[PDB]
Structure 1
């Protein structure tokens, strides 16, 4: 599913991301825009052999099991395919574990490089 901007904003707010660990809703929507272009089906391979999955591009090295990342952990205890569902619950639940692990949203390279320090509330401007 390719979400609309305001459609994703509303889904992320319903699942508890608005000001989760201090990060307003626009931070998460900006993050999803540049990680996946709002596409729950997005995948991208990493040079180390891991793969990033879903609207927030969660890495199989640490967070999900895809059966092909040697020496990996599965800290969200889920298959990486669950992060590809048109239902974003698994992705959001796992994102909360990531953003709580010490580095905040700096865990997402795209957030640090394209959202951090910008006017992220523009990503939610004009939505209900």
Structure 2
């Protein structure tokens, strides 16, 4: 599923991500935009052989099981495929664990490089929320 900007903002708010760990909803929408362009089916293979999955490009090194990332963990206790669903519940639940891990939203390199410090409220501007 390719979400619309305001459609994803609403789904993220419904699942409790708005101001989760002090990150405003525009931060989450901005990260999803640059990680996946709002596509739940987004995948990206890393040089280390891990894979990033879903709207927030969650990595198999630590967070999900894909059966093909040697030495990896599954700290969200999900198959990585769950992160590609039209239903964002698994991505949101796993993102909450990731952003609690100590480095906040820096865990998402695209958020640090393209969202952090910017006017992220522009990402929810005009949305009925």
Query: Which bracket does the TM-score occupy, shorter chain normalised?
Result: over 0.9
**Structure 1 residue matching 2:44: 3-state secondary structure:** strand
After superposing on structure 2, the runs of 4+ consecutive aligned residues of structure 1 that deviate more than 2 Å are: none
CA distance in 2 between partners of 1:18 and 1:68 (Å): 33
Instruction: Deviation per CA, 1:65-113: give whole Å up to 9, x if none.
Output: 0000000000000000000000000000000000000000000000000
Task: Give matches, 1:2-21, under 5 Å.
Answer: 2-21=2-21
CA distance in 2 between partners of 1:62 and 1:114 (Å): 23
TM-superposed CA distance for 1:45, in Å, is 0.2
TM-score for both structures, normalised by structure 1: 1.00
**Structure 1 residue matching 2:40: 3-state secondary structure:** coil
Could you tell me which runs of 5 or more consecutive residues in structure 2 were left unpaired when the two chains were aligned. none
CA distance in 2 between partners of 1:100 and 1:47 (Å): 26
Count of residues paired in the alignment: 128
TM-superposed CA distance for 1:34, in Å, is 0.1
CA distance in 1 between partners of 2:127 and 2:75 (Å): 33
User: RMSD of aligned C-alpha atoms?
Assistant: 0.2
CA distance in 1 between partners of 2:58 and 2:18 (Å): 19
TM-score for both structures, normalised by structure 2: 0.99
